[PDB]
Design a protein around this ligand. Structure first.
Ligand code: AXB
Ligand code: CA
Ligand code: CA
Ligand code: ZN
Ligand code: ZN
Length: 163
């Protein structure tokens, strides 16, 4: 099955909610980084992401520090930047970002957009990739460019799951 053990969403129209923010960026910047991160995946699959302001969305997005209720604590500045749960009900699909990081919209360490795009890959059922140029590669490194789009390896990945 190509990616045994990695769940997938049964529906293509998913909702998401940004539960809180980070002092490092303006609220609009956080919202846009998230929107664009989702767009990277939507343009290469049938996935459609819709934002809600309250209630239970399919994908919860939040900034938390150290222990935050899911037995997968963050580690303070640097190191682990965020993590996301594979597709499923409840915590499934949720993405958490380390609130102790300096979040940016530049090449400066920990560009929210890039981190979120990577995490959403996980929220959608993708595992890490060995392709060093892939968005889902295990190590973060911001590579500035003109137009941002999903590397072909990541397109192969999402297509393999959702078409
Ligand atoms: N591993 C772990 C973490 N991360 C989450 C954040 C994160 C983000 C990204 C990567 C690997 N990818 C990159 O660093 C990266 N990918 C791409 S694809 C792409 C680009 C990039 C890129 O700049 N960096 C930029 C030009 S583009 O035309 O838009 C296409 C790895 C990780 C590893 C943790 O936290 C943790 O534990
Ligand atoms: Ca969820
Ligand atoms: Ca950290
Ligand atoms: Zn968490
Ligand atoms: Zn990852």
């Amino acid at each position: 099955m190509l990616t045994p053990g990695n769940p997938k969403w049964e529906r293509t129209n998913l909702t998401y909610r940004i539960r809180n923010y980070t002092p490092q960026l303006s609220e609009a910047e956080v919202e846009r980084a998230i929107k664009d991160a989702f767009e990277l995946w939507s343009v290469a699959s049938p996935l459609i992401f819709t934002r809600i302001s309250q209630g239970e969305a399919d994908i919860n997005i939040a900034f938390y520090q150290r222990d935050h209720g899911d037995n997968s604590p963050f580690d303070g500045p640097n190191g682990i930047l965020a993590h996301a749960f594979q597709p499923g009900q409840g915590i499934g699909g949720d993405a958490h970002f380390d609130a102790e990081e300096t979040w940016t919209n530049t090449s400066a360490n920990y560009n929210l957009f890039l981190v979120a795009a990577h995490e959403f890959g996980h929220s959608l059922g993708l595992a890490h990739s060995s392709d060093p140029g892939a968005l889902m590669y295990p190590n973060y490194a911001f590579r500035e460019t003109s137009n941002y789009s999903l590397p072909q390896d990541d397109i192969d990945g999402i297509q393999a799951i959702y078409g």
